[PDB]
C-alpha cells in the first residue's frame, strides 16, 4: 500500500518556504488525499512515499490544490508519476502547466484517449470540462480583416499563462533586444562622422551581427551566381518556380529578339525558372521619417545551366501598366550599376515577400492558428493534442510580441521596411488569398513549382527528406491511435479542431484546399505533417537564413528610397546608394535579422522535446524512430555540406527548432 | 541485462547540441562502456536504457568522460542512478560537481565508507587518489598572520569550480549589489539639499532597506529597554555575560556610593550582567576621507528585573588608562543626550565586535576553515564529508568576495566602519586569540556566560534547542558509521581532518580547546555539532538581525566621527549628530546590512539540502528525523513569537540557511 | 475663471495680480524651493521604482518616505 509519488517541477517562484499541495490519487475504486511539502530542485524530481489504506485500484486522476500559497508564488509542474504498491509501473500524469488559483487541477492518466460515447466516463467528463475551460481562456481575435485569426490578447500580459515565455526565454529575448539596440546605437554613432556614398561604406556597419556566410555574401553579392543561388537555397526558397510558359507580364520591346530566342530555348529545354513578385503590385510603400519608400513587383527569369547553377536572364523591375506598357528589361550584359540596382530591387522584393508572406503569414500566423485551434478543441487527453503541443510552444507569445512591437501601426516594421505603414497588411491579405494548403506541403509545393529533382535545390531535397521523416512520425502516432478511417471520422474533437483551423482560424480556407473534415487516416496524416513542418521545418528554412543573407544589407535591402530605374544609362553609384537603405534602416534590418535568426539558448531541437505527454511505450518508440531518422538526415546534410562552398544548414534537425518561437 | 541509467543534472551551459558522454559501469566482475547523448531538462533527469551483455555483478563505480565537447560547454552533474536488470534498487552515484576536462571522473557507489587497511580495495585507491587531487586543488592560504587560514584564492576566479556560486546565486548577489548601490546613490542625492542636524534627519535615509522590526527599532531605540534587549536577542547576542564579580575596569569615582550599592545588590542577587567591549581597547580607528573615526572599549552593566527585562545600570565608554584613571560613568539618570550618546557608543562597539569577532571570525572564517579542511582531508566516500558538504556550500566564495571587496585594504569596510583601515585585522587577531572551542558551542558558551535558564534570552533558548536537535542529527549519522571509539580513533582521514582544522586551519588551536584528535564517538559528535551550528545556526543568529537592528543607524552606528564624551553636561544634539555617522557611512551601513541579512532567493533551509550524497535509507531517516525536529522547533518558536511584542525570528529553521553563504 | 463658479481676481498669471496681494520674499522663496524639493524627491522615487516590482500593497513602502509624518506612518 506504499504509493510513491514523484513530482517533476518545470519551474517555480517560491517567495516563502511552506508551499503545501493537497494531492488526490483518484482511482477506479476510490481516491486518497495527501498533503505534500513542495521543495523543488533543479534537475531532480521530488519523491513522496505515502501509505494508502484503501484499495484505489487502477489510478486514473491526480488532483492538485495549492494549500495556502502566497500570491506571488508560482508553480509550473512538469508531471506527476505514481508507482503502485507492487505494480512497479510509473503511472504518468502529465501537467506541463502553471498551477494557478485555489481551484482543483485534475490531471488525467497519461495514456492518450479518444473521446467516446459514454457520457458517464470520467475521462469524457474531464475532457468536456477541460474543453469548456480552454474555450473560455483561448479565444480567437481578428487582428486585421481578411487575415487568419489570432489569439485574443491585446498584449503579451493578456495571453493565457501556459502560453507565456518561460524565464530563460523571456530574459534572453529581452536582453538580446537591448543588445541589438545598443549595437545599433553604436553603429549609428559610428557613421555620423563617415561618408555614405559607396557600397564599401556598408562595411562601416557590417559587424557584430553577422556570420561567416554573411561575410561570404559581402564578398560575393554582386556575383550573378549568388543572386541566382538565393532563389534556391537562400533566405527565401519559397518563391522560385519552373516556367511552364513565358509570363504574360514579360513584355519584350523591339530589339530583344536574342533574349526572346534564349527565353524560348530555356523554356523548351525545361531549364527556365521564374521568380514573380507580382503580389507586391499596387502595394503602397512606407513613408519613413518623411522620406518616401518605394516598392516594385519584379519578375526575374533564371536559366539552369548543366552544372546545376542558376543564371539570371532578365529582370523586369515593374509590371506593365497602361502608363508604361513596356517596362525596361534589365540584363546581365547591361551597364553594371543598372544591373546591380535591378538585382538589388529583386532582392528587396524577395525580402518583402519572404518576411511578410513566407515568414509572417505562411509559418508564424499558420502556426498560431494551429496553436489556438489545438488549445481550443483538443483536450489534454487527446493524442493529437499531445502530439502537437511541443510544436506550438511559444507561438502565441512570439506572434503577440510581433503584433504589439514589430508589425503594429508605428512598429519596427514601419521604421525600416518599405512594405510597412499599412501596405504590409494589404500584402498579408493578398498572400492569405494565395495561402493554399498545397503551398504549405513541400511535395505538392515543389511539384507545383517544378523544383523536384533539382540537384542544386538543397532546400528542396532537405524539405522532402524532412517531410517524409515527419510524415513517418505522424503516421506512427496516428496509426497508433486511429486504427480505421471511421475512427478518424467518428472523433468529434478532431473534426472540431479541423473546422477550427479551416472554417474559423484560417477564415474559410475551404477554397484554398484546406479540409473541413478528415475522412481517412491518410488525410489526417498529411494535415498533421503539414502542421509539424510549418511549425518546425518551414519556419527554420524561412527564418534561420535572415542573418546569413540579410546582414549584408545591399544583398537584400529592407527598403528602397528611390524610384525603380527606367533607363540603364542613367544609373550611377549615387543612384544605387540613394536607392539602398540609409544607415538607420540598414542597422534595423541587421538587428532584426540577428535577433530572429540567432539560435535560442533554450531552443528545443525538432523531435527532442523533453515534455512527456504520452505515457505509453509505443508513442515513445515512434518519437525515438523520428529522432533516429532526424540524426541520420543530419549526418547526410553534414556530409553534403562539407563538400560545398555554399552549404545549406538551415534544415539540419539540430538547428530546426521544435516550434515557432522566434 | 537492461541497466537503466538516470542522469540527474544540476546545471548545464550547452552552446551546441551534441554533448556526448562516455559512461562506464564498473562492477565487481567487470565494466561496461556506453555513449550517452546528454539533453538535460530542468526538474527532470535523463533516462538511458542500455543492454549490457557481460555480468557486471554489484556496481561500484561510474566513470564519466566528456566526448568531444565545446570549450564553453559546462556540466554540473547532480547524480547518476543505475537500476539493475531485475534488482529494482536505484544504486546511487552522487557527483554534485562540475565535470571539467577530458579526464575520466570516477563516481564511487553512494554508500558512505570509512577508509580501510586493504590497499588493493578499489574504494581505498579511489579515495587516496581523490584526496591527492583535492589537496592539490584545495590549498590553505595565510590572508593575515595570526588569523585562521583561508582557501588559496586571490580572487573568486582563482577558487576551485565546485566551490563557485551557481548561476542564480551569483546573479542575485551581483544584482542586489547594484540595487544597493543604486539605492545608496539615490539616498545621497536626496540628502544633498537637506540639513543633517537632528536624529529625525536619519528618517531621510530610513527607507527601502529596512524591515518592520527596523521600524519598531526607529520608534524605540532611545528606550533603555530596547538597548538592553539587544544584548540578549538583538543582532549580537554573543557578548553579554552574567557578572560573577564586579569588573576591575569598572572604577567608580567618589559620590557613586548609590551606584556601588546597586551594583553589589545586583551582584549578590545574581541578576548583574555585563557586556565588556575590552577587545576594542587600543585598536586604531579608521580615517575615512580625511576624517578621523574614533573607537572605544566600553563596559555596560545590566540588571535583570523580575519581569525578565534587562535594564542598564552604568556605561563606562572608555577603559581606565594612566592618563584617565577614572573614566566618566554614564547612568540612565544623567542628562538624556549624554546617556543617549553613551548608549550609541556601546551599540557602535557592539557593531564592531559583532561584525568582526562574532560574524566574520566566529562564523564565516571558522566555516571556511571547516570547508577547506573538509575538502582537503575527507574524500567523497567518507560519511563525515557527505554529512558536512551541504553545510559548507558557498562558504569559500563568500569569504573570498569578502576578502577581495569588503574587508580588503581600501575595501568597503574601510569606507564606513570605524575599525577599518587595518585596525579590524588587529581586532580579528585579538578575537582569534579569544576564539575558543568553548565559545562556539552554545551549551558551553551560555554556561560560561551564565545565560542558561534566562526566560528573556530567546536566542539562548533557541540556540540550545537547535544544538540538541543538530546534535541528535550528528549522533545519528556518527553512530550509523562509527560504532565504537576505536573506529573513530582508527579513521586516519578523520584524524587528518581534525588536525587540518586545529593544527593547520585554525593555526594551532590546541590551547583554545580545539581537539587535535578524536578519541571517542562523543567527542567527534560534539565537534561536528559545533561545525554544523557554526555553519548554519550561529551564522543565522549573528547575520539575519543586521537589517532589523542596523537599518536604523543611530541604533547601532558603524562608526563614530567624534571622540567619546568625558563629561555629561557638554553633550548636545550637535555632539550626538557629529558623533553619529554621516549620511554616506550610514547609507553604506544600511546597504551592507540589507545585502547580508536578506533572505537569499536560492537559500537552502537548515537540513533541507536536496543533494543526496548518502545513498542508504538510514542516513536518510536520520535526516528526516532532523527535519521533523526542526519543524517542531519552528512551530514552538512561532507559537512563542506570536505572543511577543519583540519576536526573535532569526533561529527559525526555515529562516536558517543550510550554510554560510552571505 | 469658469462659468457657474465663484468669481476670481482678474489676474491671468501671478504677475498680473495687484502688488499688495503678492507673496512676500520669504513666502515666495519657500514656496518655489519646496516645489523644486518635491519635484526632486518625486524624481528620486520614480527612479527608485524603475527596478522594483509593483504588485503588492507593501510596494507602496518603496515610495513612502521623505514626505510623510508620524501620523502617516500610523
Ligand atoms: C534586437 O535588436 C532590435 C531590433 C529591432 C528593434 C530594436 C529596438 N527597437 C527599436 C525601435 C525603433 C528604432 S528607431 O531607430 O526607428 N527609433 C529611435 N528612436 C530613438 C529615440 C531616442 C534615441 C534614439 C532613437 S532611435 C530602433 C530600435 C532592437 O533592439
Ligand atoms: C548592496 O549594496 C552595497 C553595499 C556595499 C557596497 C556596495 C557597492 N560598493 C561601494 C563601495 C564604495 C562606496 S563609497 O560611497 O565609499 N564610494 C563612492 N565612490 C564613488 C565614485 C563615483 C561616484 C560615486 C561614488 S560613491 C559605495 C559603494 C553596494 O552596492
Ligand atoms: C512640491 O512638489 C510638487 C508637487 C506637484 C508638482 C510639482 C512639480 N510639477 C510637476 C508637474 C508634472 C509632473 S509629471 O510627473 O506629470 N510630468 C513629468 N514631466 C517630465 C518631463 C521631463 C522629465 C521628467 C518628467 S515628470 C510632475 C511634477 C512639485 O514639485
Ligand atoms: C528580419 C528582417 C526585418 C523584419 C522582418 C519582418 C517581420 C518578421 C516576420 C515575422 C514576425 C514574427 C516575429 C517577430 C518577433 C518578435 C517581435 C519583437 C521585435 C522584433 O523582433 O524586432
Ligand atoms: C552589515 C554591516 C556592515 C559591514 C559588516 C562587516 C563585515 C561582514 C562580516 C563578515 C564578512 C562576510 C561576508 C561579506 C559578503 C560579501 C562581500 C561583498 C561586499 C559586501 O557585502 O558589502
Ligand atoms: Fe520567425
Ligand atoms: Fe554572513
From Swiss-Prot, chains A, B:
Residues 114-662 form the Lipoxygenase domain. This is Polyunsaturated fatty acid lipoxygenase ALOX12. Changing residue 415 to Q: Reduced arachidonate 12(S)-lipoxygenase activity. No effect on the stereoselectivity of the oxygenation reaction. Expressed in vascular smooth muscle cells. The gene is ALOX12. Belongs to the lipoxygenase family. Its cofactor is Fe cation. Changing residue 382 to Q: Alteredarachidonate 12(S)-lipoxygenase activity and protein expression. GO terms for cellular component: cytoplasm; cytosol; extracellular exosome; membrane; sarcolemma. Changing residue 258 to K: Does not affect lipoxygenase activity. Changing residue 539 to Q: Complete loss of arachidonate 12(S)-lipoxygenase activity. Activated by EGF. Arachidonic acid conversion is inhibited by (13S,14S)-epoxy-(4Z,7Z,9E,11E,16Z,19Z)-docosahexaenoate (13S,14S-epoxy-DHA). Arachidonate 12-lipoxygenase activity is decreased when PH decreases from 7.4 to 6. Catalyzes the regio and stereo-specific incorporation of molecular oxygen into free and esterified polyunsaturated fatty acids generating lipid hydroperoxides that can be further reduced to the corresponding hydroxy species. Mainly converts arachidonate ((5Z,8Z,11Z,14Z)-eicosatetraenoate) to the specific bioactive lipid (12S)-hydroperoxyeicosatetraenoate/(12S)-HPETE. Through the production of bioactive lipids like (12S)-HPETE it regulates different biological processes including platelet activation. Fe cation binds at residues 359, 364, 539, 543, 662. CDD domains: PLAT_LOX (cd01753). It holds the Pfam family Lipoxygenase. Pathway: Lipid metabolism; hydroperoxy eicosatetraenoic acid biosynthesis. It is found in: Cytoplasm, Cytosol; Membrane. Residues 1-113 form the PLAT domain.
